[PDB]
């Protein structure tokens, strides 16, 4: 996964 | 050589931005794109290869997408401009030529191919640098088909993305990045059980497969709904998700100030929260 | 000076041990006390302040209070001793004179004084180094009252607790250290329900004030009898916990191998485990 | 809280 | 030991203050010393020697003499008292004793001496740590002579000192604390014209020995005034001047927002200003 | 791009092995060519460019030649393949085209050249990294001709080298590597009598050219012969040598647990000595 | 590859001289170019690509171009020569091939472009190292158009540059690098009225744009004709100069120990002095 | 405090020397005694306690010993003289008064005891630091003992040593050191013989016990009289040495050129030599 | 000299 | 500008 | 000279 | 041992 925001 | 040509073709429009940095002129009125990141906030001196210093503002900038447009006032002999490819063709291993403008009198070329596809980002064997940043990266026939960004692979952003966003960075700047603030991480049941028998890991993951919230960010519309770390959203809609980059997509999709349903169970407790997409900043 | 006279009564009895470090004879028997540490597990030359060099083995060990007693075999002169004074009674504040032998012919002497006391350990600003550790520490009489340990302030176990395990580490070297694996927090409810607000804390604590399991350490009695990090040991036996360092004490007041329940929480689960403590090694 | 073990 | 002694008498005043730090208590209605790094600007938990753990307010603050006036409310027990000796008669070479509370119950006690003297600030060859910052620093018979400041030598604020300010940061804790904000070094005529027979020194020095501003501070009365770096005060008043500290004088024995004028010479222009004296933050 | 060619035709068959890198099918039948060190020890899963998600098995490993073989069983679709080329006619200067699976959907693909021939080992200045290694080196007709290997310059494995160990770590995995454990150099009498004349040299070289042993290692055959350092191996058989790259040939043409005599000199004693060979490992 | 024809043509001519590097034949005479750099000072073995051990003497040096001419003895086979291009022609983005001999038996070689055009200086995204410094840079055609000088971007000197002084450093090894020793800086108006507004810059520059002496190097012609740091020369000759690259060509084009007034001024005072241009070294 | 009238007794003669670093004045006539290594060659201006700056001479140095001899003209008020004790009877556990003199008005004062005792130099747990480098170490009495000398355990030159040498460095400054050039190492047969059995050490010890060579120094009688690295010297004279402390010795009290027999072995070969003793420098 | 300030 | 020398 | 082994 | 000179 990478999420981010 | 071919890139003679190239360079040539698309080379006089390569500009130098001054911190530093490229940047390489859109049409004769005198938009040049280049990174956000060159641009430190401020609205700089564009000198062309040919020596010509004119004096550019800054009419734009998306800092998450890391590209400014710069405008010049067109004066005496015509700004050449750097003739747009599109990058929605791209092969895997076409060449790649990196063109900077890093003192305003010669181009700087190095060569490259495309080392990776992302449409998303493009990967290079090109020596992308500080030199070259903001300036164009060209195909065979000299055609601008990226936008160098410095950070042996180097990355571009792709020309169709900036393609897409030139109009808006050219009047008003503010591009629409909708956001929750969630670092989430895929799961798996054989990756959560499997965490689940490791006496010393934070937390239960509760089976299943899916996106682990892994951090909620400070000040975001995933703190404000009490979204905590840990969580698992199964979720959205009535949209099973277990993938965190297949998420990032339907915030978008949804507007600004949108308000998105969250079915999310924390431990045992099955928990629905809405949280509303503000705009990255 | 009067740590002149301290020097000169327990000095003589200093020894060189050879990686490296200082003991100090105890009895005309050959009875010698140093650092665990400074015995690398083998059984060394032992050299007196005269140019003796005896021929030490080591006849115990005792790992987690890092001391050993060596032995050497008394032949023609007497062997020198060190009296032995009691730490039970130490002053904060009062002289602490650190003798160490790094070469076998002389004593290196630093002063200080009692920089704080735990009977559990002794503080010193006086000079602990490698060159007088495991000699011992004398009060401003000149007997010992602790064994120099280096790692401005030193550390010295107390001789009170070398007494206590002398007879033991004079013959079958093993020490009952009591344990159960378990790398606990004191937590309070004012630290618990505040944990409980931050999104991102790992796991949220069920109020209350305790000992918060923050680690479950491999191949070890709590491991073995299912505790996780995260859970909360409310009470032992009836008795009511919330120090991480009480504890330690009832685990050692039962014997090796004793099996001990376990009330404790799991979030919102009450759950009851027994523990059976193991040996430290 | 210390642990130790 | 007579430590001990001094130990026993002051001891149980020296409390823990929690980032983290030690303080004493200077009577009975609760007044408590400590350094101003000790604490971060907010207004902290007290913790005594017995265990009683008060909850104190910060009365006030000096930052440049670093050290801040606690309260706590005196309930049950009489608070203990450190007696307040006076540092205007130390000598160099008088036994110093630093006393910490760096857990709450026990005091951490090192030993050394008077290692200089500026009244401006006392040195010492006893251990000064993050233990006992804030702490006092006794004499042999027990009476407080300091405040220990960690950053062997280590530093304390002369008791003499905190006296005058206690009243004002027990009260509205502002200190009047005069300054211009020019960095000053000490020339000598045979350090300037033998500056200036180096060719690459940054200017050349009109001869003279005086006070070069080797640096004008942003947003002080000294840039305000139009003071530059190069610039070489010669006279304030009609007081010639060579010395970096002597100035540091009449500017604090003049008010605040008082107008100095200063005479200049600017390489060759002679150039009187007047700086109007600001407080120090 | 001519490498889009040569990518479109072995990079399907170039995957994932999961520590991470890359591998290639060599047949249909699920063969699997990629580095041993991609392999720690283990016997993992298998993506291809498709992002069928195999499940594979190590069936041979050669540490010193750094390449193993992983098998996964053909189902559904054809499993793609990458045609095999030969590396004994290699040209310096030929294109050298890096591909990897460093995701498992996409192919990251490099350009160079052969920057260098041992045969023994490749050298390419096509960037290899993590993201390629285990994956196949291809030429400008897109067959494999090498193994990347990341440790600017990369390295490759031959072809024809995995080629000839492909059987045996299909099969059993165990590739006589023939040794005897001694640290050579090549010795020259003008080095030699030059060491002579060096007053502080470790040991006098008896003159000559040769092969001084630098080093004995541990436990090996040249240990267990009486072997020392500072000797010089003078002939092995009758053959004299003073190269240490052609003493490492005659070991491997000599099978494993073959006696083979030492003709050397122990500075003025003349020495022979038989040591037999073991098995790298 | 057309490399391959490129380093087949070149290639043999390329040696190893042994700190270490490369080099290549000029002629059939044994003339060989390097890098001074290559040359620590001494007067070195050549080993040609077949094996071939001449030996070699250094007939010349230019540090300041960093460039040797070697000579060996013709014997037996003819020595290889490579075939020299001119760089007077060279374009931006012209293939660039990197030849060098690290071992004496093989050629290493890199493929890159011309990545930037001083004539002055080349720079190639070819990669160069230690492996190829002195060695040739090629174009498609494999006429060494530089020599590669190791310090991803490489540089390389001109060969028409090493074709200038060849003679030269064939026969007696000095040439012509007039020079005075002063490190110098543009200066702008709109740099200098701004420097003169910060409070803290060194010295006041006097207005105006021109050459800013920074720094005056030590026993130079600059620090004998009394200029200092912080100096402007206005003109030379009458030549008004704000560029510190154009007077660096002046200074050449006059003679060696050739007297050039120079007006500048000194903060306000005019200040005409001349250097006498002495030999860089 | 005691210290502190030791500190009054001495202290007025300890001076500053400025490279920079403290020193002590030894008579009325003007003659400071400090370390070599405070005066860096030149020939210092000294401050007194009371501010009065002399200016003085280095009239001698003695590098190996680390101590000089600092002339001053006496005018005025009489220069304060601090008595000089006698090195020679000192206890371990003595009390130790450093003072310095670091800004040249005060006196910096620290307090400990003699660590150790080599006569040959001093040790002791008084901070000893550039604060007071060539300043003097006093007993509990106030007479100087020893010269602080930087480099917790500092070190102190004897003071019985500095009045040896004090003439001669107040004249001509050559003191009689005589050396050979032999870093030597005492070896043991069963060090030796145990050397003789690891396949790596560098040479076989010939059996025995002595003084291994371990290097000759460059330039040296003992690199002239042909000795080398790995040698064993047996007997000087006749007499059988093990000891590398030993041989310093015999050979300073045979004079400067003094010529030694040198029976030694090169690993089979007898071998005698005679070194001729020169002055270290 | 100091400065400060 | 770069001066050198 | 290489070694190895 | 020691050595020195
Ligand atoms: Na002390
Ligand atoms: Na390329
Ligand atoms: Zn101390
Ligand atoms: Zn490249």
Request: hydrophobic fraction near 10%; proline fraction near 25%; charged fraction near 0%.
């Given at each position: 996964x990478x999420x981010x925001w | 050589s071919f890139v003679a040509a190239a360079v040539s073709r698309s080379g006089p429009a390569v500009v130098r931005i001054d911190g530093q940095g490229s940047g390489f002129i859109i049409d004769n009125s005198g938009i040049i794109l280049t990174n956000a990141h060159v641009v430190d906030g401020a609205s700089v001196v564009v000198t062309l290869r040919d020596g010509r210093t004119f004096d550019g503002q800054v009419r734009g900038t998306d800092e998450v997408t890391d590209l400014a447009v710069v405008k010049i006032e067109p004066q005496g002999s015509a700004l050449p401009v750097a003739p747009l490819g599109t990058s929605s063709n791209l092969q895997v291993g076409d060449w790649a030529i990196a063109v900077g403008?890093?003192?305003?009198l010669d181009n700087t070329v190095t060569l490259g191919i495309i080392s990776t596809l992302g449409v998303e980002f493009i990967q290079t064997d090109a020596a992308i640098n500080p030199g070259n940043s903001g300036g164009p990266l060209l195909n065979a026939r000299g055609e601008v088909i990226g936008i160098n960004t410095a950070i042996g692979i180097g990355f571009a952003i792709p020309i169709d993305q900036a393609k897409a966003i030139q109009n808006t960075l050219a009047a008003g700047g503010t591009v629409p990045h909708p956001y929750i603030g969630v670092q989430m991480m895929n799961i798996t049941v054989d990756q959560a059980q499997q965490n689940n028998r490791?006496?010393?890991?934070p937390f239960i993951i509760p089976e299943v497969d899916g996106i682990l919230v892994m951090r909620v960010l400070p000040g975001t519309p995933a703190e404000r709904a009490g979204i905590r770390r840990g969580d698992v959203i199964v979720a959205v809609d009535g949209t099973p998700i277990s993938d965190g980059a297949r998420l990032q997509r339907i915030v978008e999709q949804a507007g600004l100030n949108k308000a998105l349903k969250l079915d999310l169970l924390r431990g045992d407790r099955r928990l629905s929260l809405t949280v509303q997409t503000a705009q990255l900043r």
């Open positions: - | 403008n890093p003192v305003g490791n006496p010393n890991s």
